[model samples]
Target chain A: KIMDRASKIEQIQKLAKYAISALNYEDLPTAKDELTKALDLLNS
Target chain B: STKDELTKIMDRASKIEQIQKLAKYAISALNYEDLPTAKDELTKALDLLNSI
Candidate 1:
């Protein structure tokens, strides 16, 4: 409820960028976990 | 190449240190039906890279 309609995309992009960074480091656990939350936000 | 050829290539590639990262990019960036092969190859390739 705190997030507005467009503001969520801003937050989601950070998650997306963070997940990509984790993937670049070969940190599968972090990438997978972060992406999981990101996907929740996406499909919500 | 097919998985059979890839198996041979991976076995040889396991000798190289950056194979894992290269395959990681492959899995991340490539758009193809065989992209799944890139993932399996990378997963196993990372194992091979770790012992070095």
Candidate 2:
């Protein structure tokens, strides 16, 4: 439970950072996938 | 900041849970071998909780 919760939160923050980076590089799918993964982690 | 705080709290909670679980197991099974470990864990947990 500790790992799961911590991973989920950390991943969300990583996803945001990745999204920003992807946007700067014009990589739409990468950005979307990062966000999607963040959501998926939360749902799981 | 929020995530760090949450993780810190959860870390303490997990430690307390682990200590309490060990204590419960020791009591239920009457395992004398584990008494010292349980006592140490319980003491540590209580100290941490009291400090907060």
Candidate 3:
């Protein structure tokens, strides 16, 4: 069965926000990490 | 697959909006230097999402 893509994306996007916030902290590593997480979720 | 193709277009759209807002915050913070990198992530997402 196809998963609930909506919630998955919602959470992932939320993580992206943290990534954006991480950038504000000048934390490129974390920002990149967070973005990676979203990407991972997209594939999952 | 453009905005609508994403698992959650609004989800992505909302995140895009938030990131843009955060980008503004970053400008004010004067510490957000990796804007391009972060932008790249979203852009990648949008690219695949927008495409088939």
Q: Mind giving the per-residue lDDT tens digits that candidate 3 earns over B18-38? A: 554643443333223233444
lDDT of 1 by residue, A1-44 (tens): 53474566455446545655665565666655554554455456
**Root-mean-square deviation of Cα positions for candidate 3 versus the true structure, in angstroms:** 15.8
DockQ-based ranking: 1, 3, 2
What DockQ do the predictions score, one after another?
0.07, 0.01, 0.06
| Model 3 misplaced stretches (Cα beyond 4 Å) | A1-3, B1-52
Q: Could you tell me the lDDT of residue B13 within candidate 3?
A: 55
Error of 1 at B24 (Å): 15
Best by TM-score: 3
Model 3 clash pairs are B1-B50, B2-B50
Q: Candidate 3 on A5-34: residue-level lDDT in tens?
A: 556655665776676666455555676666
The number of clashing residue pairs in each candidate reads 0, 0, 2
Docking class of 1: incorrect
Q: What is the lDDT of residue A40 in candidate 1?
A: 56
Task: Report the poorest 10 consecutive residues by lDDT, candidate 3 chain B.
Answer: B26-35
Q: Kindly report the docking quality category of candidate 3.
A: incorrect
Select the stronger candidate by DockQ from 1 and 2: 1
- B6-38, model 2: which lDDT tens digit per residue? 999788666445434533442332234333443
Q: Model 1 segments beyond 4 Å from truth?
A: A1-3, B1-52
- Among these predictions, the greatest lDDT belongs to 3
The C-alpha lDDT values of all candidates are 0.50, 0.49, 0.53
* Clashing residue pairs found in predicted model 1: none
